[PDB]
Amino acid sequence: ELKSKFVKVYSVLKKELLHDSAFGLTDDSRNWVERIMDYNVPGGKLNRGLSVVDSYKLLREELSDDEIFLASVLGWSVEWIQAYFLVLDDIMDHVGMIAINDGLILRNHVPRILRTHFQTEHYYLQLVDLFHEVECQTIAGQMLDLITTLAGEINLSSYSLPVYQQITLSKTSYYSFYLPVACALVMLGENLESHDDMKDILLEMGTYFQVQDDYLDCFGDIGTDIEDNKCTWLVVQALEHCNEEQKKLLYDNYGRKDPKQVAKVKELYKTLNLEDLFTQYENKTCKKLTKSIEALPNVAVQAVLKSFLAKIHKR
Amino acid sequence: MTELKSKFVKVYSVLKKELLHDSAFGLTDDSRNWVERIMDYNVPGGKLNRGLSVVDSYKLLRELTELSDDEIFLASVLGWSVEWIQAYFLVLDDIMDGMIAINDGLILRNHVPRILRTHFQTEHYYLQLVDLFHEVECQTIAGQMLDLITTLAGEINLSSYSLPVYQQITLSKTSYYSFYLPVACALVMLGENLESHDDMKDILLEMGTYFQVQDDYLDCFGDPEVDNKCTWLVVQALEHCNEEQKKLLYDNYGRKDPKQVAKVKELYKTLNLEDLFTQYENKTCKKLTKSIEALPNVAVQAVLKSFLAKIHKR
């Protein structure tokens, strides 16, 4: 039902944007723009764009077709903004830097949609500031990622828990966990500025998911983080949790594409019991997050947050 | 007016320290200096033509229509916002001719609405400022996309180079942020609604096209510092030449060889495109002055005449 309705909203928004006569498009440029849309936006699983509509339905307690359409419009706006973010991620992870311009086209589609479908609403400026906040912090996250990565070129003393956490927060969690639920609440008439507790919980949830992926990379059926000199949660823990010759071991073997040295790092990890440290982190995190979800007065917000936390647990 | 400029220049420091210490963004000491250096490189360097012209157009509109220090500060804030947005645009322009330049540029882009929000959210014209900068950015990047399609990717069959394509690129790529944005900022600050100024907008846009044609000519005939470019010169040469001259142009254009370059230059000279450019300049200043005077509002006329005079013959 939602599956079949949501996806048509992509076509609706696409044909709106292509035939917004504000810019003079020829046949050729129109096809250029349509291709750079259809490549990036409508492809994937549509996790977050759908989760906008799903969180909206969850909050509701009866849905009109207009309500569903607008929730879908917000969802697709999320998909667009994420397309922009992911094009930049492509560019930043290993005869055409068209990729920049393509990405920048998609970014500038986001407020055209928001303006076309929500200007009359009384929460228009709140949506604009939401997407603005999310974009500012996503790109600030990318900037932290650059500096940390570059500056951890050999000097692994750059890799600290605060740096890891700020990167995970601003780069991903914001557009990944806050943005869709925030979209739903703003449509629901709420003011986000009286939801700092929910915001913080979703942000910690994003940090949680990143720590998960960091561990899964190193322990699961292949992950290449220790080869790639990445700032994993595992290496950040290993740094301050090891002695002096273990620091020498890590400094020797980290960032090395050689399964011998990779295995040296893996077995320093195992001898430091970072699998059990991760199990403890997971348990304490799910407890803190479930506990502080229940602390929230609103029960439906709790339902949405518990949905998310359950979906990502033990993944 | 170097007495009154020094106030503008301090607003850069004010906005910079605001943005750097927005603890909403989690910045370490380290990242804080990274952001400061990527600001100080791009934004405060140049002559500050457009950022100052925001404040100058505001003063002009006031003087003709007491002028508080807050008014000046806010006009300056808008000016520096223009400087930032232009820095972003110019970083992308550099890029389009290790991969940090993208990230730096995007940091500068996302500073713009932080400033607009910090200093103009309370105002009743906030959404109008946001839509102004949004429109300008959409059309600048659309201009870049047209530039990609037309120039580099529309290579050696130069029959792609037409006056309408040239004009659309010049309009959306540059004219918008270069000539509309600064005066529009001042008018929005003045309480006006831009949607009843389409004539002024169109005039400033044509003015941007004019300035680009100027730069095109200076390139081919001039010194300062420093083929296959979509120049106004080649666009004129195309439809103003016969058939063996078309053969000459197709032979020699896009060719890095001073012999063939000179073949193009002297086809230009035998077509009298220097005199065509002088005529273009005269007819353009006349069309623009005439349609400026057509505007009902006299102070808007004063601002537009200021701009058109500043960019004339130089």
Numbering used by the authors:
A (entry chain B): 3 to 63, 72 to 104, 120 to 246, 253 to 346
B (entry chain A): 1 to 65, 72 to 103, 121 to 249, 259 to 346
Publication text:
Ultrahigh molecular weight cis-1,4-polyisoprene and trans-1,4-polyisoprene (TPI), which are the principal components of natural rubber and gutta-percha, respectively, are also isoprenoid metabolites that are assumed to be synthesized by specialized prenyltransferases.
Specifically, the equivalent positions of residues Cys94 and Ala95 on α4 in EuTPT3 are occupied by Tyr88 and Phe89 in EuFPS1. Therefore, those residues were predicted to be critical for the α5 arrangement and dimeric architecture. To test this hypothesis, we replaced Cys94 and Ala95 in EuTPT3 with tyrosine and phenylalanine, respectively, to create the double mutant EuTPT3(C94Y/A95F). Interestingly, we determined the crystal structure of the EuTPT3(C94Y/A95F) mutant protein at 3.3 Å resolution and found that it formed the FPS dimeric conformation. The mutated residues changed the orientation of α5, compared with that in the wild type. Thus, the replacement of only two residues switched the dimeric conformation from the TPT-type to the FPS-type dimer. Actually, the replacements of the exact two amino acids in other EuTPTs and their endo product analysis provided reasonable results; mutations of Cys94 and Ala95 in EuFPS1 and Cys96 and Ala96 in EuTPT5 to Tyr and Phe, respectively, resulted in synthesizing FPP, whereas Tyr88 and Phe89 in EuTPT2 (EuFPS1) and Phe95 and Phe96 in EuTPT4 (EuFPS2) produced longer chain length end-product than FPP. These results indicated that Cys94 and Ala95 on α4 in EuTPT3 and the corresponding amino acid in other EuTPTs were essential for the TPT-dimer conformation, which forms the path for newly synthesized ultrahigh molecular weight TPI. Thus, those two residues not only play a key role in determining the product length but also in the formation of the TPT-type dimer.
